[PDB]
Write an enzyme that holds these catalytic residues in place. Sequence first.
Site, PDB file in Angstrom:
ATOM      1  CG  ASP A   1      -1.797   1.195   1.594  1.00  0.00           C
ATOM      2  OD1 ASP A   1      -1.182   2.063   1.734  1.00  0.00           O
ATOM      3  OD2 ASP A   1      -3.032   0.998   1.364  1.00  0.00           O
TER       4      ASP A   1
ATOM      5  CG  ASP B   1      -3.188   3.469  -2.857  1.00  0.00           C
ATOM      6  OD1 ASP B   1      -4.241   2.928  -3.145  1.00  0.00           O
ATOM      7  OD2 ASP B   1      -3.036   4.292  -2.247  1.00  0.00           O
ATOM      8  CD  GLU B   2      -5.448  -0.702  -0.233  1.00  0.00           C
ATOM      9  OE1 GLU B   2      -5.757   0.283   0.686  1.00  0.00           O
ATOM     10  OE2 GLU B   2      -6.424  -1.604  -0.392  1.00  0.00           O
TER      11      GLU B   2
HETATM   12  N1  LIG Z   1     -12.026  13.576  -0.027  1.00  0.00           N
HETATM   13  C1  LIG Z   1     -11.483  12.411  -0.945  1.00  0.00           C
HETATM   14  N2  LIG Z   1     -11.071  13.251  -2.238  1.00  0.00           N
HETATM   15  C2  LIG Z   1     -10.262  12.584  -3.512  1.00  0.00           C
HETATM   16  N3  LIG Z   1      -9.674  11.650  -3.208  1.00  0.00           N
HETATM   17  C3  LIG Z   1      -9.832  11.397  -1.719  1.00  0.00           C
HETATM   18  C4  LIG Z   1     -10.405  11.672  -0.765  1.00  0.00           C
HETATM   19  N4  LIG Z   1     -10.235  11.016   0.404  1.00  0.00           N
HETATM   20  C5  LIG Z   1      -9.453   9.994   0.071  1.00  0.00           C
HETATM   21  N5  LIG Z   1      -9.115  10.128  -1.145  1.00  0.00           N
HETATM   22  C6  LIG Z   1      -8.465   9.359  -1.819  1.00  0.00           C
HETATM   23  C7  LIG Z   1      -6.782  10.067  -1.539  1.00  0.00           C
HETATM   24  C8  LIG Z   1      -5.963   8.966  -2.064  1.00  0.00           C
HETATM   25  O1  LIG Z   1      -5.633   8.917  -3.277  1.00  0.00           O
HETATM   26  C9  LIG Z   1      -6.588   7.750  -1.625  1.00  0.00           C
HETATM   27  C10 LIG Z   1      -6.255   7.253  -0.235  1.00  0.00           C
HETATM   28  O2  LIG Z   1      -5.162   6.627  -0.136  1.00  0.00           O
HETATM   29  P1  LIG Z   1      -4.955   5.711   1.018  1.00  0.00           P
HETATM   30  O3  LIG Z   1      -4.456   4.527   0.327  1.00  0.00           O
HETATM   31  O4  LIG Z   1      -6.046   5.667   1.888  1.00  0.00           O
HETATM   32  O5  LIG Z   1      -3.908   6.002   1.961  1.00  0.00           O
HETATM   33  P2  LIG Z   1      -2.233   6.322   1.533  1.00  0.00           P
HETATM   34  O6  LIG Z   1      -1.478   5.275   2.083  1.00  0.00           O
HETATM   35  O7  LIG Z   1      -2.015   6.747   0.086  1.00  0.00           O
HETATM   36  O8  LIG Z   1      -2.054   7.600   2.392  1.00  0.00           O
HETATM   37  P3  LIG Z   1      -1.266   7.581   3.808  1.00  0.00           P
HETATM   38  O9  LIG Z   1       0.178   8.592   3.641  1.00  0.00           O
HETATM   39  O10 LIG Z   1      -2.171   7.672   4.864  1.00  0.00           O
HETATM   40  O11 LIG Z   1      -0.678   6.256   3.842  1.00  0.00           O
HETATM   41  O12 LIG Z   1      -7.958   8.289  -1.017  1.00  0.00           O
HETATM   42 CA   LIG Z   2      -1.817   3.920  -0.196  1.00  0.00          CA
HETATM   43 CA   LIG Z   3      -7.194   3.304  -0.771  1.00  0.00          CA
END
Ligand SMILES: Nc1ncnc2c1ncn2[C@H]1C[C@H](O)[C@@H](COP(=O)(O)OP(=O)(O)OP(=O)(O)O)O1
Ligand SMILES: [Ca+2]
Ligand SMILES: [Ca+2]
Length: 341
Positions: A7, A105-106
């Site tokens: 991730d 991303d997963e």
């Molecule tokens: N309100 C939103 N509008 C648009 N995209 C969003 C919103 N909320 C969340 N996302 C998207 C943003 C990211 O591209 C995706 C989330 O990425 P996520 O996999 O949950 O964690 P991440 O691992 O990349 O972040 P972190 O640094 O916490 O680990 O969800």
């Molecule tokens: Ca991620």
């Molecule tokens: Ca996600």
Amino acid sequence: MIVLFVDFDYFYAQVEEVLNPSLKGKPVVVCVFSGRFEDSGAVATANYEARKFGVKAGIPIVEAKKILPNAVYLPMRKEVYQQVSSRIMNLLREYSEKIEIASIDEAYLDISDKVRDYREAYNLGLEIKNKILEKEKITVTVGISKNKVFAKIAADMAKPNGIKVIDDEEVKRLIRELDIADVPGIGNITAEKLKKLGINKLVDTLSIEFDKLKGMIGEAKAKYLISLARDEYNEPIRTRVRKSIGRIVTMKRNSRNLEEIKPYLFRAIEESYYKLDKRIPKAIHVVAVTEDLDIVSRGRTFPHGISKETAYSESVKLLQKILEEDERKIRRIGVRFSKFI
DNA sequence: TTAATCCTTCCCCC
DNA sequence: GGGGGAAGGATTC
Ligand SMILES: Nc1ncnc2c1ncn2[C@H]1C[C@H](O)[C@@H](COP(=O)(O)OP(=O)(O)OP(=O)(O)O)O1
Ligand SMILES: [Ca+2]
Ligand SMILES: [Ca+2]
Ligand SMILES: [Ca+2]
């Protein structure tokens, strides 16, 4: 079974620092400007420089600027990120056929064969972590456990840029001490309903009579939690398939006037077909997001494929069905194509 | 305050 | 009773 979950850390924001390192070290906030007024819109995501200060995903761009008025605010470029993901998604393939791309991303990797235990597995993690850092210059977090759910939980615990292994022993102290709200597939609404039932830990699902649970949060979601509780959960890593595509757009000013909406509706259809790329849907749905932010939709399935001329025509009629059927005003509009031939 | 899949009704009819 | 497919609201990410 031995699952390895990958991730990517603050992915969009990170992809942006990778495409301009000067950014490295400064708060970077990736936005989705609605263009309904100066700095209107929300935050797709921000790196950690900006998170320790509050700026997280989902807050208004305006609110984020009040907190960190001097952070780099950038307009989201999904495509660029989408391509960067694909490349990284291949490096991973080379580590196991049984692979499940869960999102931008997963990815879940079934290394049941490849590795023979958690020692060798954890080592394959660093090996994978390191290889992605080298080839694309991106840090990720790796979770390793008995099944996908826990492999994912392992990742949630180790971020950012980390790795962790959850062994059967820990699985057990978790099936008992893990907060029910942090269980994958259990969003706020279900986590809430589970609260009123006294179920605060994965374990509590065992003390409640199935039917009451099946009646509160759906059957599948019920049988799902139980298996996790009786450590019998074990779903396969299958290559998911895009079962529907669509796009939606916010308008400059909310509206009701048909002709006023159509232009947007179409802009959505244009973008939607382009994405389809050679794919041909038998089902179309028009989706309207009203001014009070509640969602309404209508759709039709055809006994054949949909051509663009058909989509145009049928979508306008379905929008009329919405406007009629609903008295509120439309704030957003889009379409969704599915049931691909 | 900016994409996709799941869950529960319908309705057709053996 | 129940397969089987549609539709639309409900959730999750
Ligand atoms: N309100 C939103 N509008 C648009 N995209 C969003 C919103 N909320 C969340 N996302 C998207 C943003 C990211 O591209 C995706 C989330 O990425 P996520 O996999 O949950 O964690 P991440 O691992 O990349 O972040 P972190 O640094 O916490 O680990 O969800
Ligand atoms: Ca991620
Ligand atoms: Ca996600
Ligand atoms: Ca959670």
